[PDB]
């Protein structure tokens, strides 16, 4: 039960919408793990001055190796010094193609399963929309160029068009009825049943959440969810650099440079596993093309304008399309929003003029404009959408460097003891 010093530096960088691992540490059952990270985060040089600050999120999860290797792990630990070695997973034969899990692809082109599987588990349990397809690549080598190097894509910050009710939301519930009569008792049950269905669709799609519904609870082992140990978030601001020569005089370049601390309070590691810490930089989806929902409606009806409570609480969801929110909105992208939601929140505004000035991190094209009539593709952040505003991604879009001070108490014979025989 002595101290092991695992502190270390980390220089990293990535694409906008994608979730990248910035530091992982293997731990052992019985370990007491504490982590205090501190550093600075920056963005590649901007074409113009500063406009809006990006929002940065840092996470640190704990994942039991058992969650990865399954029964195979249990045997491993059980059989002890007789265990059949754990298998490695494969990566594409390229240095960077392991980037998502924070490591260079080693000489043999394969990395420990716990890195890959954890990243997956983390993504599937907290980052993707609950209704989106569960991410299930088997090997880092099954990942595509972008994903493998920069991490998976995550959802845009929540707004009316990026947080629609799950696409399969019921818009009407049918109930059969005998040719001339209706069982009012059945109708009653019908509603009840519906209620359970809705609650589920709207917010209890995950087992754990259903059980919470009953006022019960579930261990993280129940559904194999990575354990979130610490979540930090902050805005990334900086300064402008003044141009001073004959032609650059009166010009500006935004240099974003933000300092930040991410500290995990002493945590007890019950079983062997990994402590992964990842980052995610995003820009609120402002767009000179989005307009208030009501500004777009052609026939304004009492139900739209009035804001009559009696109606707002008993109507079904409303199906509308991106065309109804952005001028160049794609009509093929349908979303189901809650009635009179446009009266519950206001959207950001950008004069159409900024629409074509390179250097602003605004979405100068309605979301999903180049991914086709596909909702998921519009919701997930497309990092290219930002290529336009950077002088040059020599270090991708963002980048950072920080010191990770890690102290871990654990049973560990001194190096002297290891190297000495008698």
């Amino acid at each position: 039960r002595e101290i092991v010093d695992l502190s270390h530096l980390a220089f990293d960088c990535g694409m906008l919408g994608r979730l990248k691992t910035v530091s992982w540490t293997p731990v052992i059952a019985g370990d007491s793990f504490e982590l205090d990270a501190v550093g600075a985060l920056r963005l590649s040089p901007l074409r113009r001055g500063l406009a809006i600050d990006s929002k940065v999120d840092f996470f640190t999860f704990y994942i039991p190796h058992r969650h990865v290797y399954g029964d195979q792990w249990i045997q491993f630990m059980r059989d002890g010094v007789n265990a059949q070695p754990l298998p490695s997973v494969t990566c594409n034969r390229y240095p960077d193609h392991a980037g998502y899990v924070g490591t260079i692809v080693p000489a043999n082109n394969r990395i420990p399963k716990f890195l890959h599987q954890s990243y997956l588990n983390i993504y599937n349990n907290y980052f993707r929309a609950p209704w989106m397809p569960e991410r299930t690549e088997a090997n880092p080598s099954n990942l595509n160029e972008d994903d493998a190097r920069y991490g998976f894509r995550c959802c845009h910050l929540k707004n009316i068009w990026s947080a629609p009710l799950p696409p399969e939301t019921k818009l009407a519930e049918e109930m059969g009825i005998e040719s001339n009569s209706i069982d009012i008792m059945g109708l009653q049950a019908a509603y009840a049943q519906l209620h359970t269905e809705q609650e589920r669709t709207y917010f209890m799609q995950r087992y754990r959440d259903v059980i919470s519904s009953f006022g019960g609870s579930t261990s993280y082992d129940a559904d194999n969810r990575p354990l979130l140990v610490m979540h930090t978030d902050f805005w990334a601001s900086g300064y402008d650099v003044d141009g001073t020569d004959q032609s650059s005089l009166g010009q500006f370049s935004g240099r974003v440079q933000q300092t930040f601390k991410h500290s995990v309070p002493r945590f007890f590691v019950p079983e062997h596993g990994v402590m992964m810490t990842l980052a995610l930089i995003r820009f609120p989806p402002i767009s000179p093309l989005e307009h208030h929902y009501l500004a777009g409606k052609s026939q304004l009806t009492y139900t739209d304008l009035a804001g009559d409570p009696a109606l707002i609480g008993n109507l079904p969801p409303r199906e509308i399309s991106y065309r109804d929110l952005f001028r160049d909105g794609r009509s093929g992208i349908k979303i189901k929003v809650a009635e009179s939601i446009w009266y519950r929140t206001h959207p950001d505004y950008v004069n159409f003029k900024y629409h074509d000035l390179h250097g602003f991190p605004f979405l100068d094209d309605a979301p999903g404009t180049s991914t086709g009539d596909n909702l998921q593709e519009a919701i997930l952040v497309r990092h290219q959408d930002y290529d336009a505003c950077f002088q040059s991604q020599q270090l991708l879009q963002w980048n950072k460097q920080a010191r990770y001070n890690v102290s871990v108490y654990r049973h560990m014979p001194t190096v002297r003891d290891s190297i000495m025989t008698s």
Binding site: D5, S7, R403, S407, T414, V415, I419
Partner: peptide
């Protein structure tokens, strides 16, 4: 962003490097 420029010392804990004697 003071520490972030300098690689930690790993001064906490016991001795790790045995290399035959003192080496600067």
């Amino acid at each position: 962003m003071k520490k972030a420029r300098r690689s930690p010392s790993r001064r906490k804990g016991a001795r790790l490097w045995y290399v035959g004697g003192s080496q600067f």
